[PDB]
Design an enzyme around this catalytic site. Sequence first.
Site, PDB file in Angstrom:
ATOM      1  N   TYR A 132     -53.139  33.909 -32.445  1.00 61.06           N
ATOM      2  CA  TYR A 132     -53.545  32.520 -32.202  1.00 61.06           C
ATOM      3  C   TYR A 132     -55.057  32.310 -32.339  1.00 61.06           C
ATOM      4  CZ  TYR A 132     -52.532  27.785 -30.661  1.00 61.06           C
ATOM      5  OH  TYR A 132     -52.361  26.420 -30.607  1.00 61.06           O
ATOM      6  N   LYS A 150     -57.767  24.486 -29.313  1.00 61.42           N
ATOM      7  CA  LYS A 150     -56.879  23.715 -28.452  1.00 61.42           C
ATOM      8  C   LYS A 150     -57.472  23.531 -27.064  1.00 61.42           C
ATOM      9  CE  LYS A 150     -53.131  22.806 -31.158  1.00 61.42           C
ATOM     10  NZ  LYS A 150     -52.845  21.452 -31.784  1.00 61.42           N
TER      11      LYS A 150
END
Lengths: 248, 248, 251, 252
Positions: B154, B161
């Site tokens: 990720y 995010k």
Amino acid sequence: GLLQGKRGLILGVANNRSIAWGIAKAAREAGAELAFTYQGDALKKRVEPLAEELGAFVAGHCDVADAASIDAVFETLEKKWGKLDFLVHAIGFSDKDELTGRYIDTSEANFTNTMLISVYSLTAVSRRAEKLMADGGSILTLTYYGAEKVMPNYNVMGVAKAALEASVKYLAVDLGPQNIRVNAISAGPIKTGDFRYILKWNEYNAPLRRTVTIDEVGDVGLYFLSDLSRSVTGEVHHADSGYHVIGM
Amino acid sequence: GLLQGKRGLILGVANNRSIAWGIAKAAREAGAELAFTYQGDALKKRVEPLAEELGAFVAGHCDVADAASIDAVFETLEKKWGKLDFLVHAIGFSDKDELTGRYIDTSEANFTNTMLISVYSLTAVSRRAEKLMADGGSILTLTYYGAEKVMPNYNVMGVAKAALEASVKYLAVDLGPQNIRVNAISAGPIKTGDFRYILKWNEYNAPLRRTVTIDEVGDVGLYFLSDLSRSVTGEVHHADSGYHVIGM
Amino acid sequence: GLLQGKRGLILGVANNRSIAWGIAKAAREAGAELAFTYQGDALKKRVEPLAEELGAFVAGHCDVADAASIDAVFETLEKKWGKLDFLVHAIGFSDKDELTGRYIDTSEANFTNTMLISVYSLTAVSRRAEKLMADGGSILTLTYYGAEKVMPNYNVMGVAKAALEASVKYLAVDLGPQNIRVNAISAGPIKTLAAGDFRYILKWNEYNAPLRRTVTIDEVGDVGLYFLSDLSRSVTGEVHHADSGYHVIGM
Amino acid sequence: GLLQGKRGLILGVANNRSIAWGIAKAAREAGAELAFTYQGDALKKRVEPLAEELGAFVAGHCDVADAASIDAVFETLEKKWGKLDFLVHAIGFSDKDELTGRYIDTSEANFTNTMLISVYSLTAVSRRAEKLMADGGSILTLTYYGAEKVMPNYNVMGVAKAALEASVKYLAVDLGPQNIRVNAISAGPIKTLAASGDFRYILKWNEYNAPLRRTVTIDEVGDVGLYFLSDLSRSVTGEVHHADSGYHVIGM
């Protein structure tokens, strides 16, 4: 002395009134050999005496939005020391005008610039520091409660610092197995747009009823740079007179 | 019809397997009039029929990098409707290769590109949305637990995010006095770079013992767009079968 | 209606101006069949007419300290319904007098009593509810931002609600495999029309919450409705702010 | 030298392998004068040799469920020192057998007792400690990530630690104006050499997944405690601080 025998680089010392200097002084007092960079030959003349004042090696010019600058700096340190023990990341720019406006009106260039300088800079520098830190080490950066809650006059820097804090976690995971620790100090505002009000707000509402000083934050820095914090990484630590606990 | 009489724009519908589609379907079932943007000539082919299934007006190509594009779309929308009630921001990208490696090896281009597309886009479209939303509405975006804690494969998107979730808070403050709400759904991974193991991890460790579906997240989306959620803004809301409570 | 063909217990409906009632009212309007409990003999004289309004079955006395009473209520419900689809937990008490002093001066009896009534009661009740929700369900409790950050006139109720939010997570792990969801609404302060420094807290929220208004029981009711319904079936372990966004404000 | 001239009370020293002891050790080596209580079922003769290893003054028996007991300790220290610089609160209890069960099966008597001993005790002891800390000081407690996320074999202690963390914040607001700090260390699990729950699995898991690939030790947490008792941390209050090899940042 807590950093006796330790060697470290402090990015972002431009005067004697900053948290970076606070950390530098404290680390020096604890026995550290330091290295300072300067941002642009205008700063060089202010940074040189500051370096003299803490016995600091001047490692070269370093603009974080220039990958070549950064490589040069670590070139210099790899020759001089051949190892880093700690690195202090105290770099952060956001556009001043847009801070006093609404966050929603944040321009793209500012967003990208702030993100690059305030956030990616740490990853960039930490990447290189890794080569010099195979024996272990501590990486430290600065944040602000505006990464966690909406704070006035902070706007895209709030967003950026939220990214910095996440990156500290991710970086902690990358570097931890090499016994390199990564951490951030979330500093309260410090007496130096609309700054007087924020300072007075902390003074009245923060548990300890005062705004933090660079000496206070410097000693928190020292703990992160020292072996006392051996077991701590990926952590955002509040040095803000307790302000973060106040919901009203 | 929870969204009876409401018009909304969904950004990011590129197929019928996505959360965006899930939200659009559920929003359409609840009586919304929808508008879809696309991204390029390849996607205009696939989007036209998806639009047809839900009676969605196609509001034109949108490249969030291109500011001109965003204004065209909202110029078009202003013409056709003259008001938006909600906006669903399901846009995100990060370089596929770099997800699989170390966050610390993230390149500047990927860092900037990811931040622009995954984070700044919401701020960009919300700024236009506001003119059309003067008399109230709901802005909704998508996030992932990788913003809060380190999740595998990720890297820079986690960091992105984190910034998006922070941006939600700042936008919520900017837009709240105009009764525009801004929220994010933190979606667990959904069956559709080492993804099988992540899905199976959630399946076995999430409290509800299943991965979430686009139908499930769509209804959470529906809630957010609906007046059920009218007291709720600046919230990151987990639609992840409870995975986020799990420490081990 | 989003709760048509569904049955639930609401605990804590003492009057028609509370979040419990807000949720009760919204749940009924969405087609649910309700059951209400009481505590006092006086409170039975207040709940019965409220139950009437929403066609609720008064399932009886439920002193949350008296473990006998809890079993007796869920015994009644299993005779009447055989299943239970949802449970709303709006129980909580702390010493009114000690709220206005310093937290540090909280008395042991108040701490224990607050903890027992405000926190353990959910666990106590969810343990009986579990047996009636074998086909899955939703359990919903109520919290306040004073559990995450220090807030005025809240003291040990903050400590308690932090406990509750923690309990919600552990309960979620226990009950999720039977597809029972456990969630909490972090509600903002609500303007009451009825009879220490609460008006000021409301005002602060009015002026500082993003939406520039304090939430109402209708609004929170609707959030509870969301948690009761299948809209929220992917959502468990969650603490959800229904507070006009106040929770994002740092200063 | 970090605690030179400082005098503090450590509650919860029962052996030489606990975080309390690691903090005591680190504090004594930093120049602190210590006081120990002996808690609940702990025997005076058992804490005595630990006290003596650090030239600690045994301040007496303390049961945190007996208000008069807390007062006695603080009267005693009030006579001997008349001034306290710090307090380490390392008390905690939960029924051993219910930790293996499901949280939801927690009995009322365990809930209440865990809460009283593990949570209220810090508020109770800080109330007495305030009176001896007019010139300010540092109050330190111990917590665990189980308070933030669901962790195994913790159940109602998780619920309790959550409350404790909240109480640190409220306490910090009450005591801050008198320059008294209140903080918590969120310690990772620590390998013990003593007799052996599913703890081995928990340790191994931290070892393999925590960023630093090792479990913390009492000397490591001892030193984090040192920082909190020292003036290095005078800007810090209301904080939950992870001394856990970074485990807290791992999502999966």
